[PDB]
Amino acid sequence: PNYKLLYFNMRGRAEIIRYIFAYLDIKYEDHRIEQADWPKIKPTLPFGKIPVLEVEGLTLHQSLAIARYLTKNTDLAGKTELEQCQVDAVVDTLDDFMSLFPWAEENQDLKERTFNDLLTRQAPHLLKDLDTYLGDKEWFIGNYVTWADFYWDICSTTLLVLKPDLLGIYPRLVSLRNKVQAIPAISAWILKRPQTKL
Amino acid sequence: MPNYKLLYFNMRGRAEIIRYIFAYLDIKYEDHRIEQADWPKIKPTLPFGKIPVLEVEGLTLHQSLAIARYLTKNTDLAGKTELEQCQVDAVVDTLDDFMSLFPWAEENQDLKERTFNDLLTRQAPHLLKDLDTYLGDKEWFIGNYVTWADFYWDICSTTLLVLKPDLLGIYPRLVSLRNKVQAIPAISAWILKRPQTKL
Numbered sequence A: 001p002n003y004k005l006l007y008f009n010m011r012g013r014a015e016i017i018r019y020i021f022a023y024l025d026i027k028y029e030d031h032r033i034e035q036a037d038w039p040k041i042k043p044t045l046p047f048g049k050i051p052v053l054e055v056e057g058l059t060l061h062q063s064l065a066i067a068r069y070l071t072k073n074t075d076l077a078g079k080t081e082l083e084q085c086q087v088d089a090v091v092d093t094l095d096d097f098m099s100l101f102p103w104a105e106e107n108q109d110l111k112e113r114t115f116n117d118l119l120t121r122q123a124p125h126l127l128k129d130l131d132t133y134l135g136d137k138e139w140f141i142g143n144y145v146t147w148a149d150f151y152w153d154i155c156s157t158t159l160l161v162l163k164p165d166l167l168g169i170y171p172r173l174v175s176l177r178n179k180v181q182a183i184p185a186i187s188a189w190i191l192k193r194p195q196t197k198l
Numbered sequence B: 001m002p003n004y005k006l007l008y009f010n011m012r013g014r015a016e017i018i019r020y021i022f023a024y025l026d027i028k029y030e031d032h033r034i035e036q037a038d039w040p041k042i043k044p045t046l047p048f049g050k051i052p053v054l055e056v057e058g059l060t061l062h063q064s065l066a067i068a069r070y071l072t073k074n075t076d077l078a079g080k081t082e083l084e085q086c087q088v089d090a091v092v093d094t095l096d097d098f099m100s101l102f103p104w105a106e107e108n109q110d111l112k113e114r115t116f117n118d119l120l121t122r123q124a125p126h127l128l129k130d131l132d133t134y135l136g137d138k139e140w141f142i143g144n145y146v147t148w149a150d151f152y153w154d155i156c157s158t159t160l161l162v163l164k165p166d167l168l169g170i171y172p173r174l175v176s177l178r179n180k181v182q183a184i185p186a187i188s189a190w191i192l193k194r195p196q197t198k199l
């Protein structure tokens, strides 16, 4: 099965797919485009957004729809429907938070006040809730890794670029990052991947 | 006895996808609707402090689309194949992305208005054109059977029509899809009895 991933040269919304491909040892083409390439490409995609994943000539879209697809019938999804629900919900909670950042905002001044608010006022509420949900479990769902844990590593990696001191009082969430990053396939991907800010 | 209690505001909003699925699958639930002024008493009781949630034997499930997808598992509503389930999820996410751009809770009523009007007059046409192109001449988004993506279009389009009643004038196939969803007997009976709210 030929897999062609297309995104910008960053971790961003494609990175969850990249982790899953790494974890499952599935070969794929990691196609990256420059900002100035994008207007020519945007009209050629069904919903004019990236990432997209081409699978056997079919173009799939929506980072989380694709990630979920790739984890189907694996433990990464959650082993039961109830667990799948919790896994999906943690991912969506994280994605909701990351989606508040005004990434394309041109007013640099406004972007900065909003970012600072997200990182200093709002993030502690989210982090507290993630910490309370993880509790003393090894992984978000309990005793096995899911793509929610991947997504926490991914989101926290960007959050830490933006605010390096953010996880001061959440040792459990730092342990979870560390557990994800020590998974041999993930560790090899992290070492290997292009070094981008986002 | 195990039962389902849905907690949300007295709105369609993000709970309505769950309500359609429950109606369609004939799943019994308590449709608990929170007045805005009571919300701050309830927020502390929910693990992630947001609604909707579904309270079930022990657990509190959260995230509208996580819950919706859970209720469709092993059901044709999900999509019949893994691939189709991906397409279903993706359409739902595209609609959710767009409804999520609206600054629903914005205090600055002048800003709120400019953003709503920009979304409805500038951005919406691109999304509608893409959804219409995706649907093409198919009976339903996925092909020949209804999925929760079609339900989610009915729901999103209902609120979008409240905000801009002429939004769908040039997209007859998207109107047709709303009509087909609304004509499903369990959906039609739910629409008939649901509380009349703006959102």
Ligand SMILES: N[C@@H](CCC(=O)N[C@@H](CS)C(=O)NCC(=O)O)C(=O)O
Pocket (backbone or CB within 6 Å): A012, A013, A042, A048, A049, A050, A051, A061, A062, A063, A064, B093, B097
């Ligand atoms: N929820 C979607 C969001 C897709 C999205 O908006 N992607 C951005 C890049 S992070 C994009 O396509 N930007 C270009 C544009 O909007 O034209 C997903 O996760 O795939």
Ligand SMILES: N[C@@H](CCC(=O)N[C@@H](CS)C(=O)NCC(=O)O)C(=O)O
Pocket (backbone or CB within 6 Å): A092, A096, B013, B014, B043, B049, B050, B051, B052, B062, B063, B064, B065
């Ligand atoms: N993506 C989440 C969003 C949940 C959300 O933010 N819900 C709003 C109401 S539409 C809420 O809980 N607002 C009250 C608050 O944040 O205190 C979902 O679909 O459940």
Ligand SMILES: N#Cc1cnc2ccccc2c1
Pocket (backbone or CB within 6 Å): A011, A012, A013, A095, A098, A099, A103, A154, A155, A158, A198
């Ligand atoms: N630029 C950018 C960007 C946009 N959305 C994201 C969502 C989740 C994680 C990282 C993200 C980065």
Ligand SMILES: N#Cc1cnc2ccccc2c1
Pocket (backbone or CB within 6 Å): B011, B012, B013, B014, B099, B100, B104, B105, B159, B199
């Ligand atoms: N207030 C509000 C509100 C109403 N309807 C929604 C539909 C989809 C997503 C978010 C929504 C928020």
